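ping. complex inputs:
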Amino acid sequence: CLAEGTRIFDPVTGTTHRIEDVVYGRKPIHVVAAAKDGTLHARPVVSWFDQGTRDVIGLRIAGGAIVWATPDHKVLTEYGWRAAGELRKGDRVAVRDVETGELRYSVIREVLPTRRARTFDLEVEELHTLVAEGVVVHN
Amino acid sequence: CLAEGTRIFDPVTGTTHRIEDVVYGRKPIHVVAAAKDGTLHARPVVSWFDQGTRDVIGLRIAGGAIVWATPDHKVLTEYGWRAAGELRKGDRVAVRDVETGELRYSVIREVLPTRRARTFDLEVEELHTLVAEGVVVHN
Ligand SMILES: [Zn+2]
Ligand SMILES: [Zn+2]
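pong. complex structure:
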Protein backbone atom coordinates (compact mmCIF):
# COMPACT_ATOMS: atom_id res chain seq x y z
CA CYS A 1 0.00 0.00 0.00
CA LEU A 2 1.12 3.56 -0.87
CA ALA A 3 0.33 6.71 1.13
CA GLU A 4 -1.52 9.69 -0.31
CA GLY A 5 0.79 12.28 -1.85
CA THR A 6 2.64 9.56 -3.74
CA ARG A 7 3.66 10.92 -7.14
CA ILE A 8 2.98 8.76 -10.15
CA PHE A 9 4.51 9.92 -13.41
CA ASP A 10 2.33 9.24 -16.47
CA PRO A 11 4.99 8.16 -18.97
CA VAL A 12 2.54 8.63 -21.81
CA THR A 13 1.22 12.12 -21.05
CA GLY A 14 4.32 13.22 -19.14
CA THR A 15 1.88 14.35 -16.44
CA THR A 16 2.68 13.68 -12.77
CA HIS A 17 -0.28 12.74 -10.56
CA ARG A 18 -0.86 12.28 -6.85
CA ILE A 19 -1.98 8.65 -6.46
CA GLU A 20 -5.11 9.37 -4.37
CA ASP A 21 -6.49 11.57 -7.13
CA VAL A 22 -5.91 8.75 -9.60
CA VAL A 23 -7.96 6.53 -7.26
CA TYR A 24 -10.72 9.00 -6.33
CA GLY A 25 -11.57 9.59 -9.99
CA ARG A 26 -10.71 6.11 -11.25
CA LYS A 27 -8.47 7.92 -13.76
CA PRO A 28 -7.26 5.79 -16.71
CA ILE A 29 -3.64 6.95 -16.65
CA HIS A 30 -0.43 5.20 -17.52
CA VAL A 31 2.58 4.61 -15.32
CA VAL A 32 6.12 3.37 -15.92
CA ALA A 33 6.44 -0.35 -15.27
CA ALA A 34 9.52 -2.56 -15.44
CA ALA A 35 9.56 -5.94 -17.13
CA LYS A 36 11.11 -8.92 -15.30
CA ASP A 37 14.15 -8.53 -17.57
CA GLY A 38 14.57 -5.26 -15.72
CA THR A 39 13.48 -2.49 -18.09
CA LEU A 40 10.71 0.11 -18.18
CA HIS A 41 7.59 0.38 -20.27
CA ALA A 42 4.44 2.48 -20.46
CA ARG A 43 1.37 0.73 -19.07
CA PRO A 44 -2.32 1.61 -18.38
CA VAL A 45 -3.85 1.46 -14.92
CA VAL A 46 -6.59 -1.15 -15.19
CA SER A 47 -7.55 -1.13 -11.48
CA TRP A 48 -7.75 1.38 -8.63
CA PHE A 49 -7.97 0.79 -4.88
CA ASP A 50 -8.67 2.92 -1.84
CA GLN A 51 -6.84 0.70 0.66
CA GLY A 52 -7.61 2.91 3.67
CA THR A 53 -5.37 4.30 6.44
CA ARG A 54 -2.49 2.10 7.46
CA ASP A 55 0.99 2.63 8.76
CA VAL A 56 3.51 3.79 6.22
CA ILE A 57 7.25 4.23 6.58
CA GLY A 58 9.31 6.53 4.38
CA LEU A 59 12.50 5.85 2.44
CA ARG A 60 14.33 9.03 1.43
CA ILE A 61 16.31 8.31 -1.73
CA ALA A 62 19.46 9.93 -3.05
CA GLY A 63 18.27 12.59 -5.44
CA GLY A 64 15.47 13.88 -3.22
CA ALA A 65 12.52 11.50 -3.48
CA ILE A 66 10.85 10.01 -0.39
CA VAL A 67 8.59 6.97 -0.61
CA TRP A 68 5.86 6.56 1.96
CA ALA A 69 4.54 3.02 1.90
CA THR A 70 3.38 0.11 4.04
CA PRO A 71 6.36 -1.89 5.45
CA ASP A 72 5.15 -4.87 3.43
CA HIS A 73 5.33 -3.11 0.07
CA LYS A 74 7.67 -4.84 -2.33
CA VAL A 75 10.33 -2.49 -3.63
CA LEU A 76 12.82 -3.47 -6.32
CA THR A 77 16.35 -3.43 -4.90
CA GLU A 78 19.95 -4.55 -5.48
CA TYR A 79 18.48 -7.90 -4.48
CA GLY A 80 15.09 -7.82 -6.18
CA TRP A 81 11.67 -7.50 -4.55
CA ARG A 82 11.96 -6.72 -0.83
CA ALA A 83 9.75 -5.26 1.90
CA ALA A 84 10.03 -1.52 2.55
CA GLY A 85 10.06 -2.22 6.29
CA GLU A 86 13.10 -4.48 6.18
CA LEU A 87 15.24 -1.84 4.43
CA ARG A 88 17.97 0.43 5.76
CA LYS A 89 20.28 3.36 5.01
CA GLY A 90 22.74 2.39 2.30
CA ASP A 91 20.46 -0.18 0.69
CA ARG A 92 19.95 0.46 -2.97
CA VAL A 93 16.52 0.56 -4.60
CA ALA A 94 15.66 0.41 -8.30
CA VAL A 95 14.65 3.78 -9.79
CA ARG A 96 13.81 5.51 -13.03
CA ASP A 97 16.59 7.82 -14.16
CA VAL A 98 14.65 11.00 -14.89
CA GLU A 99 17.04 11.78 -17.75
CA THR A 100 17.59 8.55 -19.71
CA GLY A 101 14.47 6.87 -18.36
CA GLU A 102 16.49 3.77 -17.50
CA LEU A 103 16.39 1.57 -14.39
CA ARG A 104 19.39 2.10 -12.08
CA TYR A 105 19.96 1.94 -8.31
CA SER A 106 20.01 4.80 -5.75
CA VAL A 107 21.07 4.60 -2.15
CA ILE A 108 18.59 5.22 0.62
CA ARG A 109 19.53 8.35 2.56
CA GLU A 110 17.50 7.60 5.69
CA VAL A 111 14.45 5.54 6.66
CA LEU A 112 11.73 7.73 8.18
CA PRO A 113 9.53 6.71 11.19
CA THR A 114 6.13 5.04 10.64
CA ARG A 115 2.89 7.09 10.44
CA ARG A 116 -0.84 6.93 9.78
CA ALA A 117 -2.11 8.12 6.40
CA ARG A 118 -4.53 7.07 3.65
CA THR A 119 -3.17 4.34 1.37
CA PHE A 120 -3.78 3.22 -2.22
CA ASP A 121 -2.91 0.79 -4.94
CA LEU A 122 -3.09 0.51 -8.69
CA GLU A 123 -2.85 -2.64 -10.79
CA VAL A 124 -1.05 -2.30 -14.08
CA GLU A 125 -1.64 -4.29 -17.25
CA GLU A 126 0.89 -7.10 -17.68
CA LEU A 127 4.17 -6.02 -16.01
CA HIS A 128 2.46 -5.58 -12.60
CA THR A 129 4.57 -2.74 -11.20
CA LEU A 130 4.72 1.05 -11.18
CA VAL A 131 7.31 3.81 -10.74
CA ALA A 132 6.31 5.97 -7.72
CA GLU A 133 8.42 8.89 -6.41
CA GLY A 134 11.04 7.76 -8.88
CA VAL A 135 11.24 4.33 -7.23
CA VAL A 136 10.29 1.04 -8.92
CA VAL A 137 7.68 -0.76 -6.78
CA HIS A 138 5.26 -3.68 -6.78
CA ASN A 139 1.79 -2.99 -8.19
CA CYS B 1 -0.96 -10.87 2.70
CA LEU B 2 -2.02 -14.51 3.28
CA ALA B 3 -2.40 -16.21 6.67
CA GLU B 4 -0.46 -19.31 7.69
CA GLY B 5 -2.25 -22.55 6.81
CA THR B 6 -2.92 -21.27 3.31
CA ARG B 7 -2.68 -24.19 0.88
CA ILE B 8 -0.67 -23.67 -2.26
CA PHE B 9 -0.92 -26.40 -4.86
CA ASP B 10 2.34 -27.05 -6.75
CA PRO B 11 0.99 -27.58 -10.27
CA VAL B 12 4.29 -29.09 -11.34
CA THR B 13 4.83 -31.64 -8.55
CA GLY B 14 1.14 -32.00 -7.73
CA THR B 15 2.21 -31.44 -4.11
CA THR B 16 0.12 -29.18 -1.86
CA HIS B 17 2.07 -27.01 0.59
CA ARG B 18 1.21 -24.76 3.52
CA ILE B 19 2.45 -21.29 2.52
CA GLU B 20 4.44 -20.60 5.72
CA ASP B 21 6.54 -23.70 5.14
CA VAL B 22 7.27 -22.48 1.62
CA VAL B 23 8.47 -19.21 3.20
CA TYR B 24 10.37 -20.63 6.19
CA GLY B 25 12.51 -22.81 3.92
CA ARG B 26 12.58 -20.47 0.92
CA LYS B 27 11.31 -23.48 -1.05
CA PRO B 28 11.57 -23.16 -4.87
CA ILE B 29 8.12 -24.52 -5.67
CA HIS B 30 5.70 -23.74 -8.44
CA VAL B 31 2.15 -22.49 -8.16
CA VAL B 32 -0.73 -22.06 -10.60
CA ALA B 33 -0.89 -18.54 -11.99
CA ALA B 34 -3.42 -17.01 -14.38
CA ALA B 35 -2.44 -14.88 -17.35
CA LYS B 36 -4.26 -11.57 -17.94
CA ASP B 37 -6.21 -13.31 -20.71
CA GLY B 38 -7.65 -15.32 -17.86
CA THR B 39 -6.02 -18.75 -17.97
CA LEU B 40 -3.72 -20.78 -15.72
CA HIS B 41 -0.07 -21.69 -16.03
CA ALA B 42 2.66 -23.28 -13.95
CA ARG B 43 5.12 -20.77 -12.50
CA PRO B 44 8.13 -20.82 -10.11
CA VAL B 45 8.21 -18.88 -6.85
CA VAL B 46 11.09 -16.45 -7.25
CA SER B 47 10.53 -14.59 -3.95
CA TRP B 48 9.34 -15.39 -0.43
CA PHE B 49 8.15 -13.06 2.33
CA ASP B 50 7.39 -13.40 6.02
CA GLN B 51 4.97 -10.45 6.21
CA GLY B 52 4.27 -10.86 9.94
CA THR B 53 1.00 -10.98 11.92
CA ARG B 54 -1.80 -8.87 10.54
CA ASP B 55 -5.55 -9.07 10.47
CA VAL B 56 -6.99 -11.56 8.05
CA ILE B 57 -10.60 -12.17 7.09
CA GLY B 58 -11.87 -15.44 5.66
CA LEU B 59 -13.96 -16.11 2.56
CA ARG B 60 -15.57 -19.55 2.58
CA ILE B 61 -16.09 -20.64 -1.02
CA ALA B 62 -18.62 -23.02 -2.51
CA GLY B 63 -16.88 -26.35 -2.66
CA GLY B 64 -15.32 -26.12 0.80
CA ALA B 65 -12.27 -23.86 0.59
CA ILE B 66 -11.79 -20.91 2.96
CA VAL B 67 -9.32 -18.14 2.21
CA TRP B 68 -7.77 -16.26 5.10
CA ALA B 69 -6.17 -13.07 3.88
CA THR B 70 -5.64 -9.38 4.62
CA PRO B 71 -8.71 -7.28 3.62
CA ASP B 72 -6.50 -5.52 1.07
CA HIS B 73 -5.55 -8.68 -0.80
CA LYS B 74 -6.57 -8.57 -4.43
CA VAL B 75 -8.76 -11.51 -5.37
CA LEU B 76 -9.88 -12.20 -8.92
CA THR B 77 -13.67 -11.92 -9.15
CA GLU B 78 -16.63 -11.60 -11.54
CA TYR B 79 -15.32 -8.05 -11.79
CA GLY B 80 -11.56 -8.57 -11.78
CA TRP B 81 -9.10 -7.72 -9.01
CA ARG B 82 -10.89 -6.65 -5.82
CA ALA B 83 -10.08 -6.39 -2.11
CA ALA B 84 -10.98 -9.36 0.08
CA GLY B 85 -12.39 -6.97 2.69
CA GLU B 86 -14.89 -5.37 0.34
CA LEU B 87 -16.45 -8.73 -0.61
CA ARG B 88 -19.70 -10.35 0.46
CA LYS B 89 -21.83 -13.51 0.37
CA GLY B 90 -22.93 -14.22 -3.18
CA ASP B 91 -19.95 -12.51 -4.79
CA ARG B 92 -18.13 -14.77 -7.17
CA VAL B 93 -14.36 -15.28 -7.07
CA ALA B 94 -12.12 -16.83 -9.73
CA VAL B 95 -10.97 -20.37 -8.90
CA ARG B 96 -9.12 -23.34 -10.29
CA ASP B 97 -11.46 -26.19 -11.16
CA VAL B 98 -9.73 -29.11 -9.46
CA GLU B 99 -10.90 -31.40 -12.26
CA THR B 100 -10.30 -29.58 -15.56
CA GLY B 101 -7.79 -27.15 -14.09
CA GLU B 102 -9.65 -24.24 -15.69
CA LEU B 103 -10.55 -20.83 -14.25
CA ARG B 104 -14.24 -20.50 -13.34
CA TYR B 105 -16.21 -18.61 -10.67
CA SER B 106 -17.55 -19.88 -7.31
CA VAL B 107 -19.90 -18.10 -4.98
CA ILE B 108 -18.77 -17.05 -1.54
CA ARG B 109 -20.71 -18.95 1.12
CA GLU B 110 -19.98 -16.59 4.02
CA VAL B 111 -17.36 -14.01 4.98
CA LEU B 112 -15.69 -14.92 8.28
CA PRO B 113 -14.73 -12.36 11.01
CA THR B 114 -11.23 -10.82 11.11
CA ARG B 115 -8.40 -12.36 13.19
CA ARG B 116 -4.71 -12.14 14.04
CA ALA B 117 -2.37 -14.67 12.44
CA ARG B 118 1.03 -14.81 10.72
CA THR B 119 0.95 -13.67 7.08
CA PHE B 120 3.02 -14.35 3.96
CA ASP B 121 3.54 -13.62 0.32
CA LEU B 122 5.18 -15.15 -2.70
CA GLU B 123 6.11 -13.43 -5.95
CA VAL B 124 5.70 -15.49 -9.09
CA GLU B 125 7.69 -15.21 -12.29
CA GLU B 126 5.83 -13.23 -14.96
CA LEU B 127 2.06 -13.72 -14.41
CA HIS B 128 2.26 -12.29 -10.85
CA THR B 129 -0.51 -14.31 -9.20
CA LEU B 130 -1.05 -17.62 -7.44
CA VAL B 131 -3.88 -20.09 -6.78
CA ALA B 132 -4.36 -20.42 -2.97
CA GLU B 133 -7.11 -22.56 -1.36
CA GLY B 134 -8.42 -23.03 -4.87
CA VAL B 135 -8.89 -19.28 -5.29
CA VAL B 136 -7.03 -17.12 -7.82
CA VAL B 137 -5.28 -14.25 -5.99
CA HIS B 138 -2.76 -11.45 -6.45
CA ASN B 139 0.89 -12.37 -5.88
ZN1 LIG C 1 -0.80 -6.70 -10.28
ZN1 LIG D 1 4.46 -9.87 -8.29
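The first strand of chain B starts at residue 2 and ends at 3.
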